[PDB]
Assembly symmetry: C4
Homo-oligomer: 277 residues x 4
Amino acid sequence: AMNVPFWTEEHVRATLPERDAESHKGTYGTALLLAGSDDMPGAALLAGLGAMRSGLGKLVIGTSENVIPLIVPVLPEATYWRDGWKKAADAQLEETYRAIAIGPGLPQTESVQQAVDHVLTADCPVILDAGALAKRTYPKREGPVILTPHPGEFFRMTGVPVNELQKKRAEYAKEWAAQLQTVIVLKGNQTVIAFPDGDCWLNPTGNGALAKGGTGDTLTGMILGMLCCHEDPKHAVLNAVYLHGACAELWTDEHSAHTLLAHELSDILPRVWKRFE
Amino acid sequence: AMNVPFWTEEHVRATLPERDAESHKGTYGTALLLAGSDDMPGAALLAGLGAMRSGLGKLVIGTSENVIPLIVPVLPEATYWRDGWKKAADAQLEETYRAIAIGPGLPQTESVQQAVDHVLTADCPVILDAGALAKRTYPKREGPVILTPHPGEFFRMTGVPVNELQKKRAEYAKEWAAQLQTVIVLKGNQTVIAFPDGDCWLNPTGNGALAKGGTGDTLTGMILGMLCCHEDPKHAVLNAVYLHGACAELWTDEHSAHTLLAHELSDILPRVWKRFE
Amino acid sequence: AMNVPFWTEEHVRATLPERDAESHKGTYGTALLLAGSDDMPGAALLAGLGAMRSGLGKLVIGTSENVIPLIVPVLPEATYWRDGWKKAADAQLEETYRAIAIGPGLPQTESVQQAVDHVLTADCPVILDAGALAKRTYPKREGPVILTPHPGEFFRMTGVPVNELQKKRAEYAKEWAAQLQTVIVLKGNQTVIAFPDGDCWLNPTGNGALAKGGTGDTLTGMILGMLCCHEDPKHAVLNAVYLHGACAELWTDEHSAHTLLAHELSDILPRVWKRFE
Amino acid sequence: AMNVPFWTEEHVRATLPERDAESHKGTYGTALLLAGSDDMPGAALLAGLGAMRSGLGKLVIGTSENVIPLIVPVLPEATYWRDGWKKAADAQLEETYRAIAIGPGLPQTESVQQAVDHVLTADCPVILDAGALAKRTYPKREGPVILTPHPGEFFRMTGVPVNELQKKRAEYAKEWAAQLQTVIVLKGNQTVIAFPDGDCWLNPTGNGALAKGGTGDTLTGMILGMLCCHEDPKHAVLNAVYLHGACAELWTDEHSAHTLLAHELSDILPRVWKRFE
Ligand SMILES: Nc1ncnc2c1ncn2[C@@H]1O[C@H](COP(=O)(O)OP(=O)(O)OC[C@H]2O[C@@H](O)[C@H](O)[C@@H]2O)[C@@H](O)[C@H]1O
Ligand SMILES: Nc1ncnc2c1ncn2[C@@H]1O[C@H](COP(=O)(O)OP(=O)(O)OC[C@H]2O[C@@H](O)[C@H](O)[C@@H]2O)[C@@H](O)[C@H]1O
Ligand SMILES: Nc1ncnc2c1ncn2[C@@H]1O[C@H](COP(=O)(O)OP(=O)(O)OC[C@H]2O[C@@H](O)[C@H](O)[C@@H]2O)[C@@H](O)[C@H]1O
Ligand SMILES: Nc1ncnc2c1ncn2[C@@H]1O[C@H](COP(=O)(O)OP(=O)(O)OC[C@H]2O[C@@H](O)[C@H](O)[C@@H]2O)[C@@H](O)[C@H]1O
Ligand SMILES: [Mg+2]
Ligand SMILES: [Mg+2]
Ligand SMILES: [Mg+2]
Ligand SMILES: [Mg+2]
């Protein structure tokens, strides 16, 4: 209806970063992932894997103490801020991060919102997902704030019921990205990527293999890592959403769309990303 | 003897569901798996993997607290109801699930039966396996009840000794499916799928690679997930049993039948399912 | 010197068992593995994997309580006898097993020997390895007792120093198999398989990829599982030793012999075993 | 500027060791890895995997008690010295090791330095990395001491600021290897391998896929294992650095350089090492 353009292969190819011979991990920065709780621990592993796969230099995972041991054998390259998402409720971050994501596997509580407020005083891009998504406003700051709601969370954020949202996805995503002055990645088939400056795109990749628990946690991590290796955070978000969907498409070439497990998206991304280089 | 027909490839191909571009995980529903105990923890992982592989939208695993950490690194896409199979002994389920399975890795106790009674008040299809299999009757309810006994459990349920059962497998499975008004998946070579309306089929797939611990826990999960993505729960059960056996057959093309580990069935299913699309 | 014959491919091909369509896991039996302690936990996982890969029907692992959680995510098909190797010091086994292995990852203590004495009152074949190897004698019983020493353990058992042993491997292995009335699998290049009835063979397979921690724990498990699916326990031992070495040879076709990790032997065995069918 | 030669393929091919049919694990020795702490546990797994992959006979990991369970399911071939890096602060090592590495995942504390002093009284080669790197001097002893700093750690050790170091990498590495009488592996593109006898080489392999957390922990382990299977420890260090970089190059043939996870280097090494045989 609004003729929102697709973020195409040609756009991905033109904007994906190089990883130079002369580079060191500091070039690609340290990300912080605030995720995973005692009954939703897996989100931390999914987002962690997505993030380390996606071109950062280092990852610190601020997860609950009991979640840490569940991540290490699979992703031994991450380090930890013990109970970090809880600690973030109480004070400003003291360390500097290239990008921060908060919310996968966190409960929808006021303490999580207090952590969100403290994280927003950092200068870097910040992603809010899952439990960190609420009906709220956002303070003027330097770096972008990137909200990644599925339609139900969009309802939680805006009061737009899902049946209404789905009739006019881009129009609502653009309106609320403008109102909130946040990026909104509105999930679904033809995911909408709406920017607060009015730019908006649709994602052309993906399929129903993604319609299963965990694939959004993986996407949050992919965005987090891409924010670390792209100079332009807009391109980071767009490329993450694109490549995430492209991994599901590779999967369905030889596997049934009913059978994908989200973590596998992260196993697929290395080969998929190569093809766009 | 009763000329029970085989559930053939043509029947599988005709009944397996599509996963549409327009679908979201809610289309495919949330399953509940009540499984895994302190000395039989592995059943929860096996059934969990089978279920998430088999086309559901979300999985909640109600397992013992100490089992949770054993699942997460392998299946980070599941979420948890802490001590859920124990809690289910005490009250009705408050949440709505598309399908429920109970029993893999649970002890054969009265408390497990109390959980079975509470789960049966939900409206959805319910699978009973392993520890949840007992000599008992079942209340009239909407959704099917699906019993998945091996011959020894069939003896436990009915008093038909195994040596007698095995002479007349389909005849006993049909008689007891009718008597109990439950589906009975009577395991073994040429697994019998007997419906309480008198329909009955034999499964043509599988081999002795399946004759090892854990392959039935995997099947329970496969049924659970297929109940979530098939409109017709009869087809869900039939296709699960079929594809489960078909995975063992793929395995023996290049691997010895002595050497399969059950979890691998779940690794194989993505490619096997593709071939029937 | 004694012209001990090699257990050749032709002998393996002639003696490896079928896994019939009509079989059920009870045909292949339940094995017991008594292994793994707090500072040597990994032996339980290695032997467990070897055993479940090698044609048994079920595996019970009697390991230390803290070891259990380390096995489950990798080998969810095993079930547990909590603190079983310790409990076995105190009383006779109450359950019937097709075969029992004791020792990988256990300390060389008198309590382990007390467990060995209790296990020997069962009727089945029993394997003793690692910590269960000591200077001792063995009671007359039905089933074979299979000792699997490396040269250092052979010294511990017999007082024959390693430098002397290695000059006359088969002669010492045969002499002590006769004296003790046990099978002795004397490890090394050209592993000796000496039977107490005077039969003796050399193993022709394997290479220096096996000269690393854990490969013997894996072999113990392989013997354990093969004792469950072979009618003739002599053939079980011979085939296990052979196929174990054959897996190392497959590995070195495309990988450096310096780089094998023992658990991988178990990943390789499915394809290797197929080729001998 | 100093015309430091590259350690080339021809040099690797000429110096890599054989793994003879007649060898036993004692030929290849027991390594000790003192690594991994509660908030940096993953370094122990990464270095452990690197070391066991790299031709040793046995590995003992002296890690924190809570780290042990995180390693076992992935690397069940290692055994443990419980809280070993902490215990090493208090007394001389009682056991003999072929090589020792200390530091990955350890804090930069005085107690770690006390462990370093105790480890240096052993006769064998010793690697110091990460937390074990400090501004200090080293006692005359038999075996080489191998420091593996990235530029920031080199600054910590020497006071040479990173911006200055990077202009004259080999000149500074050679000067300080001479001053300290240690080997210095100065990490980065064209890693410098400076020996205290004045020999110096550059490493020609690797790429920016290595510019991510954990790849240096993996290298520490690779050096540790290669010190066990090379007679000449100089060649061990050179070959480790070379093959480590060569694994990143294999990865980028079909995968994006942004996407490598360090542990995968260890999965790649078996095939890469084969090609240099
Ligand atoms: N039909 C489709 N076509 C293309 N993309 C799709 C489709 N359906 C879903 N997707 C994509 O799948 C992802 C779904 O993300 P979420 O809804 O956030 O899923 P997620 O929150 O990970 O999972 C739900 C829950 O299960 C748990 O495993 C997880 O921790 C969470 O609590 C989005 O990228 C979305 O665009
Ligand atoms: N010869 C055969 N041909 C075809 N299918 C077969 C054959 N033998 C067995 N099967 C199939 O293998 C499966 C066996 O299921 P169960 O008997 O339920 O096995 P399961 O309960 O998983 O394992 C036994 C025990 O070991 C533990 O790992 C597990 O938790 C359980 O306690 C069934 O689908 C059955 O039809
Ligand atoms: N050069 C060779 N050629 C052929 N086979 C060989 C060779 N070298 C060793 N092997 C074979 O490798 C195996 C070695 O077994 P063990 O000596 O028992 O090794 P294992 O006890 O597993 O490992 C030593 C220690 O490290 C730990 O990981 C493990 O738990 C144990 O404490 C035997 O099958 C042996 O014949
Ligand atoms: N552009 C490049 N070209 C070639 N090699 C490179 C390049 N960039 C880095 N490398 C190589 O990558 C390795 C980096 O090692 P470290 O800096 O020690 O990295 P490491 O300490 O493992 O990781 C940093 C932190 O993250 C955690 O996961 C880890 O435990 C540690 O705390 C070295 O071998 C280095 O030469
Ligand atoms: Mg989500
Ligand atoms: Mg069963
Ligand atoms: Mg041994
Ligand atoms: Mg480092």
